[PDB]
Paper text:
Here we describe RMC-7977, a reversible, tri-complex RAS inhibitor with broad-spectrum activity for the active state of both mutant and wild-type KRAS, NRAS and HRAS variants (a RAS(ON) multi-selective inhibitor). The binary CYPA–compound complex then binds to active RAS (with dissociation constant Kd2) to form a tri-complex structure in which CYPA sterically occludes RAS–effector interactions. Although neither RMC-7977 nor CYPA alone exhibited any measurable binding to GMPPNP–KRAS, RMC-7977 makes multiple π–π and hydrophobic contacts with RAS in the switch I (SWI) and SWII region once the tri-complex is formed.
All residues in the binding site are identical among HRAS, KRAS and NRAS, and RMC-7977 is equipotent across these RAS isoforms. Kd2 measurements for all three wild-type RAS proteins were approximately 100 nM (KRAS Kd2 = 116 nM, NRAS Kd2 =  101 nM and HRAS Kd2 = 94.7 nM). The RMC-7977–CYPA binary complex was highly selective for the active, GMPPNP-bound form of KRAS. Furthermore, whereas MEK inhibition did not distinguish between wild-type and mutant RAS variants, RMC-7977 exhibited modestly lower potency and incomplete wild-type RAS suppression compared with KRAS(G12X) in cells.
Residue numbers in the entry:
A (entry chain A): 0 to 169
B (entry chain D): 2 to 165
Write the structure that this text describes.
C-alpha cells in the first residue's frame, strides 16, 4: 500500500496550526479560535507523481505543557514548524521547538519545514527575508501560507513529505 | 451568604442527576455573579440547554458555551469577556469550579469542574466555586469523555437555576 508519513504540526498558540491542517484536510476555514488539546488527521495525496498517506498530528501550542512533547517528537517523522507573520514572539518561539526536536532525534538533519502563516493579514512584523535566513541557517525550506486564502497550504505539507523522502531515500 | 446554583444533567436527553455548586461570592463576587445569573437565565441567555463539550477523565469536565455550542463561544453578563477578578483561590482537588479562558482577561461563560487537583492552573484560571452536592454526577460524566476531551454522548445542562 501507499507509504504513510507521520507529520507533526508544532508552534506557538494561535499561529494557525489547526487552521492550516483543517484547510488541508477539510477545505474550510473559520475565524473561531478552538485551542487544541491534541488532534490527529489522515489524508491521501499525490506528491511528485507518488500517492501517499499523510498522518498528521495537530499539537497544542499551549505554552505551559512544553515538557509533554517528547513522545510525539520521537514518533514524528517530519515537523511543520509554524509561526505567524504578524506575531514576532511566535517567530522567536520557533528556535525552541527546533532545539527540542533536534535533541529527541539526536540529529541536525530532521525533516522540517518552516511555515510563516497568516500571510493574508496586513499587519506583518516578520519579513520574508528574516524567515528565509533562519530557514537557510537550519538547512530547511521556508513557505509562506494563509489558512484563510489557502495560499501555500498544500505546498507546505507536500514540501514536508519531500523532505522526509530525501531523508529516508539516501 | 454565598449563593448556590444547580445543574440538572442529562445524557443524550436522559436524566442523570443534579449537581449543585457553592459560588464564592465572598472572595470573587463579580465572577460568582456572572455564573449565578447565567444559571438562572435572567439576562435572557445562559447555561440552560448547553453541553459539556470537553471531558477528560482524570482531570476535568468543561462546559458553558451556550452561544456557539462548539467549545469556542460563550459570553458573560458583562460583555463577551471580562477581566480576571483575582487568583486568591486555588485548584485544590476534585469539585473545584473555575473559569475557562483563552489567555489573560478573557473570562466569558465557559467553566470547568475539576475531577483531580490541577495546581498548574493556579494563577491562570479564576477559581470561584465548588461542587456542594452531586459530585458523583460529575464522576459519572467522565465515562463519556476521552483523552483529548471529545465526548461520546451529548452531556447537557437540561435545567439550571439558583437554590434558596
Ligand atoms: C499537553 C496535553 N494537554 C494536557 C495534559 C496535561 C497533562 N499533565 C499536566 C500536568 N502534569 C502534572 C504536573 C505533573 C501531569 C500531566 C496530562 N495529560 C494531558 C492531556 C490529557 O494529554 C493529551 C492538558 C492540556 C490543555 C491544553 C492543551 C493541551 C493539554 C489547553 C488548550 S486550551 C486550554 N488548555 C485552556 C482552555 N481554554 C479553552 O478551552 C478556551 C476555548 C476558546 O476560548 C474559550 C475556551 C481552558 O480554559 N480549560 C479549562 C482548564 C482545563 C483546560 N481547558 C484543559 O482542557 O486542560 C486539559 C488538561 C488535561 C487538564 C491539561
Ligand atoms: N487571517 C488569518 N487568520 C488565521 C490564519 N490561520 C489561523 N487564523 C486564525 O488564528 C486563530 C488561531 O488559529 P488556530 O488554527 O486555532 O491556531 P493554533 O496554532 O492551532 N492554536 P493552538 O496552539 O491553541 O491550538 C483563529 O482565530 C484562526 O481563524 C490565517 O492564515 N489567516
Ligand atoms: Mg490548534
Amino acid at each position: 500500500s501507499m507509504t504513510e508519513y507521520k507529520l507533526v504540526v508544532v508552534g506557538a498558540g494561535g499561529v494557525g496550526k489547526s487552521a492550516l491542517t483543517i484547510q488541508l484536510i477539510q477545505n474550510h476555514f473559520v475565524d473561531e479560535y478552538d485551542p487544541t488539546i491534541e488532534d490527529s488527521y489522515r489524508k491521501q495525496v499525490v506528491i511528485d507523481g507518488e500517492t501517499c498517506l499523510l498522518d498528521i498530528l495537530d499539537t497544542a501550542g499551549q505554552e505551559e505543557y512544553s515538557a509533554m512533547r517528547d513522545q510525539y517528537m520521537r514518533t514524528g517523522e517530519g515537523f511543520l514548524c509554524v509561526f505567524a507573520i504578524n506575531n514576532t514572539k511566535s517567530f522567536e518561539d520557533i528556535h525552541h521547538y527546533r532545539e527540542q526536536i533536534k535533541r529527541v532525534k539526536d540529529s541536525e538533519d530532521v525533516p522540517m519545514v518552516l511555515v510563516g502563516n497568516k500571510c493574508d493579514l496586513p499587519s506583518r512584523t516578520v519579513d520574508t527575508k528574516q524567515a528565509q535566513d533562519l530557514a537557510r541557517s537550519y538547512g530547511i525550506p521556508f513557505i509562506e501560507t494563509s489558512a484563510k486564502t489557502r495560499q501555500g497550504v498544500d505546498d507546505a505539507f507536500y514540501t514536508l513529505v519531500r523532505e522526509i523522502r530525501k531523508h529516508k531515500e539516501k | 451568604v454565598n449563593p448556590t446554583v444547580f445543574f440538572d444533567i442529562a445524557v443524550d436527553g436522559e436524566p442523570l442527576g443534579r449537581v449543585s455548586f457553592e459560588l464564592f461570592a465572598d472572595k470573587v463576587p463579580k465572577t460568582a455573579e456572572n455564573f449565578r445569573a447565567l444559571s438562572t437565565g435572567e439576562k435572557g441567555f445562559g447555561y440552560k440547554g448547553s453541553c459539556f463539550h470537553r471531558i477528560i477523565p482524570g482531570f476535568m469536565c468543561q462546559g458553558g458555551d451556550f452561544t456557539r455550542h462548539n467549545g469556542t463561544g460563550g459570553k458573560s453578563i458583562y460583555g463577551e469577556k471580562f477581566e480576571d477578578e483575582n487568583f486568591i483561590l486555588k485548584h485544590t482537588g476534585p469539585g473545584i469550579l473555575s473559569m475557562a479562558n483563552a489567555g489573560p482577561n478573557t473570562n466569558g461563560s465557559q467553566f470547568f469542574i475539576c475531577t483531580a487537583k490541577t495546581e498548574w492552573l493556579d494563577g491562570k484560571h479564576v477559581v470561584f466555586g465548588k461542587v456542594k452536592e452531586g459530585m458523583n454526577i460529575v464522576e459519572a460524566m467522565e465515562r463519556f469523555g476521552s483523552r483529548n476531551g471529545k465526548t461520546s454522548k451529548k452531556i447537557t445542562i437540561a435545567d439550571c437555576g439558583q437554590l434558596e
